[PDB]
Design a protein around this nucleic acid. Sequence first.
RNA 1: UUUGGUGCCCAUGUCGCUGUGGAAACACCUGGUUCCAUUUCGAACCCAGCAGUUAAGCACAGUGGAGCCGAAUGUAGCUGUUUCAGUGAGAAUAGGAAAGCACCAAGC
RNA 2: CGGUCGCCUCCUAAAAGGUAACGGAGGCGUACAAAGGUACCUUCAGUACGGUUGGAAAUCGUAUGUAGAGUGUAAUGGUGUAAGGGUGCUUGACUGUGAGACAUACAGGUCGAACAGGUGAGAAAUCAGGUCAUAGUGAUCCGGUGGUCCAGUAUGGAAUGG
RNA 3: UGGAGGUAAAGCUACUGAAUGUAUGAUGGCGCCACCUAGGCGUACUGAAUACAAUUAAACUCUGAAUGCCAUUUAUUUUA
Lengths: 88, 136, 50, 116, 48, 179
Amino acid sequence: SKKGVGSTKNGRDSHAKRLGAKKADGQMIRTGQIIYRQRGTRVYPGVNVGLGSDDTLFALSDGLVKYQKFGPKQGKTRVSVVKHKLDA
Amino acid sequence: MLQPKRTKYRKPHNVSYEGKAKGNSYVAFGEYGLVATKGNWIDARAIESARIAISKCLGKTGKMWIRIFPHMSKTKKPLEVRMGSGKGNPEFWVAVVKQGTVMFEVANIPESQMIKALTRAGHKLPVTWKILKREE
Amino acid sequence: AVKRSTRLGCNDCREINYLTFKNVKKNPEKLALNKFCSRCRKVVVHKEVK
Amino acid sequence: MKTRTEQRRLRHKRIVKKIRATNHDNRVVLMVIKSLNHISVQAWDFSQNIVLASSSSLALKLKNGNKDNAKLVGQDIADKLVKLKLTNVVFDTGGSKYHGRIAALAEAARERGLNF
Amino acid sequence: KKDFHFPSQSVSFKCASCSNSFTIESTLKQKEITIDICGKCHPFYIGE
Amino acid sequence: NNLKAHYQKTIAKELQKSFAFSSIMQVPRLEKIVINMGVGDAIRDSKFLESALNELHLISGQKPVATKAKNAISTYKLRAGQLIGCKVTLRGERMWAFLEKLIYVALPRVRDFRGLSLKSFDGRGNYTIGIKEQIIFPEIVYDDIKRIRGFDVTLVTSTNKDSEALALLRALNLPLVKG
RNA sequence: UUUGGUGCCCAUGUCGCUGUGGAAACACCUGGUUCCAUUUCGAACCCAGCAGUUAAGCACAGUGGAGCCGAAUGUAGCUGUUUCAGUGAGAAUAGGAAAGCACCAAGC
RNA sequence: CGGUCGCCUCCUAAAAGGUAACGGAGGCGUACAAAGGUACCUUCAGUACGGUUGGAAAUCGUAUGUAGAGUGUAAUGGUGUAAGGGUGCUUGACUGUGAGACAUACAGGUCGAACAGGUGAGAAAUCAGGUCAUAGUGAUCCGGUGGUCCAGUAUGGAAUGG
RNA sequence: UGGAGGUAAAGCUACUGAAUGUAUGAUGGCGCCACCUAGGCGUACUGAAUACAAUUAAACUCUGAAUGCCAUUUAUUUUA
Ligand SMILES: [Mg+2]
Ligand SMILES: [Mg+2]
Ligand SMILES: [Mg+2]
Ligand SMILES: [Mg+2]
Ligand SMILES: [Mg+2]
Ligand SMILES: [Mg+2]
Ligand SMILES: [Mg+2]
Ligand SMILES: [Mg+2]
Ligand SMILES: [Mg+2]
Ligand SMILES: [Mg+2]
Ligand SMILES: [Mg+2]
Ligand SMILES: [Mg+2]
Ligand SMILES: [Zn+2]
Ligand SMILES: [Zn+2]
């Protein structure tokens, strides 16, 4: 005897968006490359770093990326692109 | 039968009893206590049996505290049912007892009755119990 | 699906150059915006076109 | 809810945050602060966080608080900037509405060779 | 602010017993309107 | 106002001596009298509210701004986005004119002005006067709303202590029981 | 060095309590006739002047009350190999703490 | 037999990303001519006290309160001078594009500096190629509509196509 | 060597739920009166809020690793 079985009601899931950090600290980067994909600003933008229509951080100039902790109780993260600054 | 009045989620993941002792490790309300030596899942039915046992073997002035509480529920699929078609329905509530958690404590009656009272409470529970006193 | 889209056409060359949205139930009056026109190469009034 | 000075600081913080976010060509930032008696002016540089040029009613020795002396202050600060070889500036108020004395100072600076 | 149809004009108020022509700005008739109970004509304010 | 200059001289001297205040402006100064003629019939009889405003206008010389609720309640038929109530805040010369006109014309015309005091300060120095009827105010014609209402005239002061506010009230001779 | 302005910082920077201060400046303040303004109020914004003012704000000294920070020892978890070597938290505690770093204008 | 079939959010998912089950909870097939763009101004909910109708709770004044408020929505993340509220002027909810990247079997998807044309706000700097962000969507074939500097089966048209 | 993260652990006066005892206690139930409506004195007892001491969590976090991941520096190796 099988006795019959009930029915499940929740078996739905969405595609996983590949968010998170893309360029790590110290890595050289050119303008227009993605540095951080997020839903809501988890990492604030600094100098030479822009914002998009999806809160995506992208570079605005050549240089080395650099994360700096700031804000109350050092709970806010900020990214920047420190220009090559070769300056001979 | 101790039971939470409401829960946010009917079917939660089971909580492991393997590990050391997180909280409820030292007698802090009474001065004699029933410590566990083997982590296990014990349900509200065992609490009620143990609590009723203590109360029957208590006196007219003894006072007791129940530390552990059956927060987490467990399910059980109905009999003769093949695997699939979702999780079963909640059946019984169990308190998670780890190795070293003080379950029952007693005070305000002489030592022999308290030692005997903790013995009958621990014979109602699956965990291997042991008696401890309160630090001065 | 529901059809809340609407078309906006120029008023000089009578060419349709834009595709927008409009709620007929809420907004009852025809759109009379001013947008860039590829033909006239200037800004000109664009009205709703059936 | 506050006093006038605190509200001006709050509005000034808004303006400073906006300028530091959008000033891409690293122009010198000419912050003017107007008081009840006098109005002073200082040209900071947010890249170096120093003051390149300064001008004030105390420096010019005038019974200020008038639209007349604002023109003199603007002429002096613009002359100093021209000598400093900086002409691309951004003009922000200390948090006060751009009008009256503030407008006169800006126009005097603009008419003396400044680009803003 | 200004440019109003209701002008605040200094109208005088007379009273019985004690004249006490108090001049107060109001949007009423421009004459000595007589009030029957004023401040001075009250048992509470003066008179035990 | 001549009595305004009288307020200046008299309040300065007497108050200064009464508490040995080290500065003439340490004495309390009255700032603003808010008037709030608000009614809930605008949810149903909107017309009434309009007339309300005009009468309020006729009392002070400032046109009343209509206030809106910050919540919505079904039992009161309230909903967000509606205007239920006007508030006027008088300052400068006009506020003292209204204050004097109230104490000298409107108030002693009150049906039974037995007064109420000591039990009105909010603990921070304010004071609210709850008028019962509008007709008693001289700046009102007999033709009015089908419903009659009162007022919620309130007062403020520079000081934060209610006792010093009471002292200013006594210096101004605001006529209440023992205060 | 001190006062005033401002940037960097984002409580060991706060909230509060007790006192002192103004020369110059900062401020309240004096009026709305001008430019400008109130979803209504010269309250605010904006004007043109400093009569009065040290209550405020503001600036100094004290205050360990609230808030914040937090050593060493020990412990829980981890990595290996052991059934012992590193790594080392959270909580608790002695305790610190009445901000700090630069630029400009004035008497110094 | 019952249930489900596409997309979005959280957990399982083991602190990069990814990771299944007829595993545990929910939503979507939109809404807004303003809830878009810009300039300026402004900042909780609740609670305490004091006050006619008016009441536990409508509105007012003062104080306190560090988010429990709002951000059209299911959750998550973000945001208290903000991305929330109000006002004025507007339609960039543009045209032609597009170096460089994210993620991907493909098809498709996502972000975007910068250039030319002509505009909107603003004194100007600057911002605007739809909204705080992620769901709101369906290939090819076939036929219909508008425009068109292309073709027009000997030639000129037309039909019929591009 | 630098950085991203929020798991193990731990904590619940740092929130959301669950939750133990003691003390002060809104609240009701329960009475006994007066009063038909404003209420009052004790409550076998229920229990808001606060203080003290102690707890629980995949969809709780004021915190919080190691390992692993990305990038770079040095040394060595392979032409993948
Ligand atoms: Mg997902
Ligand atoms: Mg002082
Ligand atoms: Mg079937
Ligand atoms: Mg991992
Ligand atoms: Mg992951
Ligand atoms: Mg939401
Ligand atoms: Mg707008
Ligand atoms: Mg918006
Ligand atoms: Mg076909
Ligand atoms: Mg032919
Ligand atoms: Mg855990
Ligand atoms: Mg908790
Ligand atoms: Zn055209
Ligand atoms: Zn009289």
